[PDB]
Structures are given as structure tokens and as C-alpha cells.
């Protein structure tokens, strides 16, 4: 069923959140963990005490496809052995994001075509910048059209609202 999941997006914020590679999108699913730089940590913040649910909608740079949701569960705080840029240091990112993966199935930009996110000029959702906002109705519509992830169960993710 899809009840459960309408009820965790019900009023939430949704954000496009990009990663440098796969290998940090497959520690994120394995430990429940996100890390930004500054500028997008500030934002996060600011919209966890904001909204019943934050919503991140993960793309690897160049892949062609989203790789999954998840929701925040606390504000950032202060070793991951995140896999960086090079010439980027571990001190250069902000705090960790704890996260309760939603979906972890991928979905191809091919099939987000018919939508539109009114926070980028109304440009396709798989366009934006990383950090950037999704409206309400575009990102629950994104959300939706992802394969169903049967392994996880949205009990657990409901309590924490
Ligand atoms: C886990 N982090 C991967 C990310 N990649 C990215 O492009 N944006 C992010 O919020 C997070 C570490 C990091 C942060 C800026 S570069 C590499």
C-alpha cells in the first residue's frame, strides 16, 4: 500500500540532495547518516524545526537517476569514513544528519519528466542545485512514483513525528 508513506509526506519539506559518488550514498543507506557542507546544513536545520517531515531526495552527480528518499530524524550534530573530493578535508563539511531511509530503490529521470518544481523556474525536478527546495505537490509526486520499497516499514518512521 501507499497510506503509510501519504501519511509521513503529509505537509512535509522535500530537498534535492546530490552526491559526489555511489560509495556515499551506499554508507548513507547502511548507517542512517548524512553529511553537508555548511551552507545546506544551515537550511536543513532551519526546515527540521519547520515541518512535521524533511524529506531528502538523493541523486549521484551524472547518473541519470535519483537512488532514494529518506527523512530526517534529528538536526545536525558534531567518524564517518565518508569517501571526499580530493582536496577536501573532513573538517570542510558540517555536522551529521541522522535519517530514516524511506525508499531505497532507484528511480531514472526518464520517468520524472512530468513534473515541474516551481522553486526552480518550473524546470523538470531532476534540475537544481544541490540543496535545492522541492514545493510540496512536486515532491510528494516525485516520491510516489518510486518503485515501492517492501522491505521497509513506516511504523517505526511514524512514532517519530
Ligand atoms: C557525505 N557527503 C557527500 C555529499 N556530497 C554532496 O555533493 N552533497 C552533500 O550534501 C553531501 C560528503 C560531501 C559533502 C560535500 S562534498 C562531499
Known sequence: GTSKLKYVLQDARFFLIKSNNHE?????????????????????????????????????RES????????????????IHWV??????????????????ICRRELPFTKS????????????????????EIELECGTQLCLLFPPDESIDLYQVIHKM
Do not use: C, Y
Not at 550514498?25 to 524533511?54: C, D, H, M, Q, Y
Not at 532514494?68 to 550534530?77: C, K
Not at 577536501?88 to 558540517?94: D, N, P, V
Open 113 to 132: 519528466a512530468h513534473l515541474t518544481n516551481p522553486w526552480n523556474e518550473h524546470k523538470p525536478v531532476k534540475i537544481g542545485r544541490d540543496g535545492q
Open 24 to 60: 556515499n550514498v551506499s554508507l548513507a543507506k547502511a548507517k542512517g547518516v548524512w553529511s553537508t557542507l555548511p551552507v545546506n546544513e544551515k537550511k536543513l536545520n532551519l526546515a527540521f524545526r519547520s515541518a512535521r517531515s524533511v524529506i531528502l531526495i538523493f541523486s549521484v
Open 84 to 101: 571526499l573530493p580530493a582536496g577536501m578535508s573532513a573538517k570542510m563539511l558540517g555536522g551529521v544528519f541522522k535519517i530514516d531511509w
Open 64 to 79: 541519470g537517476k535519483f537512488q532514494g528518499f529518506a527523512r530526517l530524524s534529528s538536526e545536525s550534530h558534531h567518524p
